[PDB]
Amino acid sequence: MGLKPCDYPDIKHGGLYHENMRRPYFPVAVGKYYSYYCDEHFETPSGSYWDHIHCTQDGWSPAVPCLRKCYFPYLENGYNQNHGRKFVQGKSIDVACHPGYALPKAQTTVTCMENGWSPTPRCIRVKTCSKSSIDIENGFISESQYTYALKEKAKYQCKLGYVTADGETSGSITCGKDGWSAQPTCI
């Protein structure tokens, strides 16, 4: 009999051409296909603004007729190589931020979703702790960098004969939003 029919395709971010003619012939028998378009900022799986939606035994095909088209923005606090390039939904792109700057928070790639880039492509200044801020007696900071990023550690070694609070000959402190995890002590 009938391996029966399909209903009016609810195209998200698009629509059917000749909408006034097609409605309703629906339900529509399988095999029947319709030309359709995608809205601005969106594209068909062919990479064009228009295509055809086929009524299959398992529904309408493509299942996602309209895919988002992401434009890569300018990164003021990062290195630019893709500014102006377009990417189809589901694509991941590497993001190189300047030293001291990161993505939020803190991925290394930005992915194109139906709702746009995820997360937003922008390099934000990272919170830091200063070494000039550390204070250790009977030991020294054996690293040795000036700026430490959140969650980054500062290594320290004790002087010959002195031990830390573990009590090992060396340890480390952590940089958090509130400053350093603590003071290094070598007794």
Ligand X SMILES: O=S(=O)(O)OC[C@H]1O[C@@](COS(=O)(=O)O)(O[C@H]2O[C@H](COS(=O)(=O)O)[C@@H](OS(=O)(=O)O)[C@H](OS(=O)(=O)O)[C@H]2OS(=O)(=O)O)[C@@H](OS(=O)(=O)O)[C@@H]1OS(=O)(=O)O
Residues of this chain that bind ligand X (CB under 6 A): 71-74, 83-84
Q: Are the C-beta atoms of 91 and 72 separated by less than 8 Å?
A: no
User: What residue is closest to ligand X based on CB?
Assistant: 71
Contact stretch for Cl ion (CB under 5 A) within 23-31, 35-43, 74-82, 147-155:
74-82
Q: Does 183 bind Cl ion (CB under 5 A)?
A: no
Contact stretch for Cl ion (CB under 5 A) within 21-29, 86-94, 114-122, 174-182:
114-122
Please return the burial class of 156, using the count of CB atoms within 10 Å of its CB with bins 0-12, 13-18 and 19+: buried
Contact stretch for Cl ion (CB under 5 A) within 10-18, 45-53, 133-141, 164-172:
133-141
Measured from the CB atom, the residue of 76 and 137 that comes closer to ligand X is 76
Q: Pinpoint the alpha helices (H) of the chain.
A: 19-22
Pairing of strands 33-38, 50-56: antiparallel
Q: Are the C-beta atoms of 82 and 96 separated by less than 8 Å?
A: no
Q: What letter would DSSP give residue 20?
A: H
- Give residues in contact with Cl ion (CB under 5 A): 75-77, 122-123, 136, 140
